[PDB]
Amino acid sequence: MMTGRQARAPLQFLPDEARSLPPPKLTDPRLAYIGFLGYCSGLIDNAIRRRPVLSAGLHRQFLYITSFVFVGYYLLKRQDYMYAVRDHDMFSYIKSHPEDFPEKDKKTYREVFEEFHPVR
Template sequence: GVHRQVLFTTVGWFVGYYLTKRTEYIHAKLDRELFEYIRQHPGDFKATEKKRIGELLEDFYPVR
């Protein structure tokens, strides 16, 4: 009946909420580890010069 729908909706919401929190935690932990590695090894990650968008894209020639 309706009570099962409410129960399953509530359980699904809580499971989704905690799975979302867990994935956010795992990604934040990975980001922290990677940024720490980059901070400790700056020679491996040299900053490149910034390019303008016009330098990255090819010239556009419309086909008719």
């Protein structure tokens, strides 16, 4: 539904507006979770090929962790870029059309009528 925004300039993973956003820190919990996913994948390779699970192939585990962290960082960058685009289009349309979305006067509780149902 954002395809119109991805209409003029296609097949761009991170457009020029994505560089103006704060990138995710390396201590982000999502990045740590994806690194844990890569570590679990390395453990599964140590398990299914009948190898020792916690010592065999440290290079394979490090490669899995690095690849998972790399693709997770780029996917998180794309995710927060898209969510920022969503909120910016939101606020642009809500500045653009005030006739179809008016204001509400929040009444106090001293005059709004409510019906009380007794529990007994």
